[PDB]
RNA sequence: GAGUUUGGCGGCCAUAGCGGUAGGGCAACUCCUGUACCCAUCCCGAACACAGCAGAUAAGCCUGCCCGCGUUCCUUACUGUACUGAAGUGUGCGAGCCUUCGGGAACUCUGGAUCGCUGCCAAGCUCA
RNA sequence: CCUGGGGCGGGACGCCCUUGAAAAGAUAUCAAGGGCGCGCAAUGGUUGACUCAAGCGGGUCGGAAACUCGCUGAAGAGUGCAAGAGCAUAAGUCAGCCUGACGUUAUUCAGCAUAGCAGUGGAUGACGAGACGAAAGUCGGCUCUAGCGAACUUUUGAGCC
RNA sequence: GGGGAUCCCUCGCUCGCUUGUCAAACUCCAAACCCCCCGUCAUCCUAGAAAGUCGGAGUCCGGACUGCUGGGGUA
């Protein structure tokens, strides 16, 4: 039977480009966001902790608040709203 | 089994050796024929395919044998250089219960082709061109697809 | 500023198996060299030579400077300071492995000890080696700065008269 | 070692071999300034650096060469020169507007009695807040004049010069 | 007040790497001289640490250059080719393929470029 | 009970990874490749010092089977166990010091796209105590995703009704 | 490494330069559809958008055509 764990079908989803593997840039981890500021979900495989479920890959949410070193996002899946915790290392601003 | 059982291309490829098991060997022994060390044949004709299909290795072996016999009989042992191109990488499986767990098991090997894709190639002199055409026409008779002959190099010489 | 000064000399002492031969190997090494040594372990278990994983097998020291000079002159006089090209290498690294040890000056004969083979090696380098080994800004030496065999023999003959065959 | 398209080349500051990015990532998580105490042979350098998406802006940058105005006519590579540099840096940064941060020694060994910890002593004694512990602070016996006693007994004009430079550092920045 | 040089901390992370070659050190960095002290070696003042005057640009670093490998970019052809979204009383015995409107490669080809760009601060200076 | 009628065979009857699956998400068959119902007081935590696989050149019968010195070496090694992913001043190797393999508690995510459903797990946190370290920080076991079970009943722990 | 006392010498497997084929569990590359968000147009909307609360159900034997070379199977 097929499994239904939390990392299924992520062979290429959670990979790094060949000229990207290793230590990722550190400035991406100290970026700071404010309220109501659209961001993009782009999971960085190099960081093991604070990773949202990879089904939210490539979605855009808005910041709602901060809990420690993690921002609270508001992502739409289908017709629902899902609140996703993610460290700022996996996030990326929207360029207007 | 009959030829038309495994000749159409309806399903995905199935060629990874390390996952399947027990593929039987092949019969075709040598893929280069005639004077390999020569490189000064001015005419280079070839047999091409008019439709996508699968060719069993046995058909390729029969075609190679017949072309070899004709070319050696007429042109000479040192007057040509035949070279087969397509190698059989596909695998053929035959179910053998009913439809209960109908997935088959390996029985042979086949080589897929594509339209206008060269299969054989013969190089000869100017005086043995007609013999080359005569040889390549019999070889295409054992082949499971319509086939036409194209003179690739030295077309102005022959034509 | 670009003369091929000797870097250091490592006095390896293999025994083929641990035990009393190993221990008195370090003993004679510290008598002959004037500083303690350190054992070397194995990498796996090879019963053919009768070894086992992570068992001590030999000895080693890394004397340098005036100790290196004195050992060089001593063992050069011992083996006539005449080196053929077999041990010799691309960077002037000699590796002459003499076996009998009592021929050293000051090694008193022992019926139990008798003989214990060793090997002597020298490493030649040009001035400037901080660059390849310092923790900060660790670069790599370029080819033109690297040492050569003929300059190695020239240095050996000029500083010690170390003839090379 | 680029031999093909799959080869991975390190960052520029890694090829230079003058940075450690894991340490940098651990340091930036403090949300607070950093004190950089990089040293050399002819002198020592201290400066306060904060991060930004473009580069690393710096607010204060004091160097041990600046003692020449005050009158520290001694060696610039000793521990006491590091203490003087740290002291004047601390006063300068306190008056400027900045007060605290984190100690960052980069790729250097953290051993007690070092010149980096001498600069740390000079910083802490000035009022510049910084988290640390006292056990690594070098004792003043080497701070004054006594780490060069055994080879330069003919030169023991240090302590009066140290006192004069300390009082002049206080005078200028107060 | 503008510029140059040097030094430190960095952003993009091979257009920056690999290899080759000719020049420079006055201020600065480095190499470089030893082991009283804090400090150190699974042995070694090698390294790290400390103390620093000598000599040197042979190395690190800096400037100029090289198409010789690797990477990035443009152009000629391959070619509007392969593939493809929508509609079709268009077509083949069949597995399939064709027409119109809209998108559009990869390799390879002729010829050129790429031997990094750039942010903050300090010091020596060089002007009015 | 499933089942290309039932039977026989087997378990596609619970959990985890790759493909099928048609470049968001979902997607069936007795579809293909398979694995798990555990092991470890160190094979765990932290700090410090280092670089691994494989070749080339040298040394004594240390034989094409040993250990050592120099060079090339972004990883071709190792990381307890499947498959896939991650990792180089390290998530690897060794040494020192330690037991966070801690008590209590709140949300959000998936199991169970969209769109109800236990128990139970995994990510952020909060209170109370610690380990290592100059500090920053890391530590809620063993780099990430498997190694497991409601109500009722008995037994055990602290204090109460 | 296999052929028949200086291993007399043959020499397959293997390593490099060139030629000819591959991949569903390969990828230095890489579309057209498609998905989240911002702006604009356009349509719906105070004769009530989005959201929320309560009442009543049926349904969980489906089938076919045009595409996906869909998977399996000789079909
Ligand atoms: Mg039944
Ligand atoms: Mg019903
Ligand atoms: Mg219809």
Numbering used by the authors:
A (entry chain BR): 2 to 97
B (entry chain BI): 4 to 99, 111 to 173
C (entry chain BF): 1 to 165
D (entry chain BN): 1 to 174
What does the study report here?
pmcRibosomes are essential macromolecular machines responsible for protein synthesis. Here, we report the cryo-electron microscopy (cryo-EM) structure of the ribosome from Methanosarcina acetivorans, a previously unreported high-resolution structure from a model mesophilic methanogenic archaeon. Compared to ribosomes from extremophiles, the M. acetivorans ribosome has a simplified architecture, lacking paralogous duplications and containing a reduced complement of ribosomal proteins. Methanosarcina acetivorans is a methanogenic mesophilic (∼35 °C), nonhalotolerant (0.4 M NaCl), neutrophile (pH∼7) and strictly anaerobic archaeon that has emerged as a model organism for its methane production and scavenging.
To investigate the rRNA modification of ribosomes isolated from methanol- and acetate-grown cells, particularly around the peptidyl transferase center (PTC), we increased nominal resolutions of the 50S subunit ribosomes by combining particles containing 50S subunit (either 50S subunit alone or 50S within the 70S form) and obtained resolutions at 2.38 Å from methanol-grown cells and at 2.85 Å resolution from acetate-grown cells. In both cryo-EM maps, local resolution around the PTC reached approximately 2.5 Å or higher, allowing us to identify coordinated metals without ambiguity including magnesium, potassium, and zinc. Only a modest difference in RNA modification profiles were observed between the ribosomes isolated from methanol-grown and acetate-grown cells. Compared to those from acetate grown cells, 50S ribosomal subunits from methanol-grown cells do carry two additional modifications: G2260 has a 2′-O-methylation (Gm2260) and G2615 has an N7-methylation (m7G2615), which is positioned near the PTC. In addition, the similarity of the combinatorial ROC AUCs for 50S between growth substrates further supports the overall similarity of the ribosome structure in these two conditions. Our comparative cryo-EM analysis of ribosomes isolated from methanol- and acetate-grown cells revealed nearly identical structures of rRNAs, consistent with our previous in vivo DMS probing study.
